[PDB]
Amino acid sequence: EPLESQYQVGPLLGSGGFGSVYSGIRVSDNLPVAIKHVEKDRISDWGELPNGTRVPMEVVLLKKVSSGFSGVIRLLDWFERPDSFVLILERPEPVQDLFDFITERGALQEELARSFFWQVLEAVRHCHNCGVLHRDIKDENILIDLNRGELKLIDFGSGALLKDTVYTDFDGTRVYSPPEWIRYHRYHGRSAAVWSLGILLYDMVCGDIPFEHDEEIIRGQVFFRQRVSSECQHLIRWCLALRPSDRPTFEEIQNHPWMQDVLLPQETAEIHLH
Ligand SMILES: CN1CCCCN2c3ccncc3Oc3ccc(cc32)OCCOCC1
Numbered sequence: 621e622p623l624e625s626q627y628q629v630g631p632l633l634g635s636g637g638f639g640s641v642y643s644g645i646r647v648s649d650n651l652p653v654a655i656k657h658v659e660k661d662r663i664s665d666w667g668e669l670p671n672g673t674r675v676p677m678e679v680v681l682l683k684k685v686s687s688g689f690s691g692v693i694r695l696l697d698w699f700e701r702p703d704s705f706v707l708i709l710e711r712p713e714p715v716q717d718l719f720d721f722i723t724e725r726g727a728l729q730e731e732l733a734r735s736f737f738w739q740v741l742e743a744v745r746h747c748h749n750c751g752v753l754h755r756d757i758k759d760e761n762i763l764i765d766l767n768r769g770e771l772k773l774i775d776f777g778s779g780a781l782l783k784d785t786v787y788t789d790f791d792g793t794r795v796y797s798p799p800e801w802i803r804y805h806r807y808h809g810r811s812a813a814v815w816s817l818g819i820l821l822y823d824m825v826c827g828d829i830p831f832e833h834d835e836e837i838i839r840g841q842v843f844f845r846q847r848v849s850s851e852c853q854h855l856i857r858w859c860l861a862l863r864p865s866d867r868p869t870f871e872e873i874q875n876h877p878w879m880q881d882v883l884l885p886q887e888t889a890e891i892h893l894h
Pocket residue numbers: 633634635638641653654656693709710711712715716717763774775776
């Protein structure tokens with residue numbers, strides 16, 4: 621009843637395992653929104669809102685992380701349809717997938733990749749403080765507000781509530797999966813997120829993902845195809861340490877030499893995103 625009137629639906633932005641996302645405009649404020657339709661049959665992880673109502677995990681996670689300014693695309697609303705869930709998320713404008721961005725612009729200058737990695741870390745870190753693990757940190761799940769240089773996390777469909785215990789489930793792509801998921805199908809939230817941050821930083825500074833097969837991941841040896849500062853190489857190879865315990869914390873990532881002199885998102889929009 622309130623969905624089709626409150627929001628004007630537009631072109632399909634994307635469709636896939638996340639469902640079908642449409643460009644939308646909230647008639648209330650002419651605000652750019654993304655309308656994410658998720659069929660219930662395809663929903664794997666369910667949870668209960670504090671209100672006492674059963675919803676997709678992504679709703680729970682977003683509601684926990686969408687209180688306050690964050691590098692996370694906020695859940696503005698949600699609706700239950702008969703066989704469908706409809707999430708109204710923020711739509712930055714103009715905006716691009718970090719995936720599309722990289723595939724177009726090739727490897728990223730370390731100044732851009734530094735701004736971008738730091739913003740991703742602030743977002744993952746905000747999620748962690750809200751008790752949320754994203755579990756699918758990848759270039760497709762990072763949007764780029766191009767006028768503001770702001771990276772914004774999306775797609776918590778594969779995420780979960782932060783647990784200090786072991787996770788025995790993963791719905792991310794095998795190339796982003798930590799070697800401990802590959803060998804043991806067990807992993808720990810923070811350390812696996814740091815692993816995916818290493819994969820993401822490699823992708824940023826290199827234009828491509830470091831490992832395409834399980835064997836290269838298990839091996840954990842990382843080869844650079846682009847000129848990548850010795851310091852950035854150390855950060856990546858640290859985040860991609862085979863042992864999760866040897867992996868850096870978010871403080872240790874952010875307090876790392878390559879993560880120094882990070883440009884604010886506005887400066888990075890002027891210097892790199894026109
Ligand atoms: C091929 N890409 C991806 C389109 C779907 C991404 N999509 C989401 C997907 C899963 N979960 C949440 C999402 O929220 C969003 C918020 C704003 C958006 C898009 C999304 O507009 C940006 C356009 O991005 C570039 C097009």
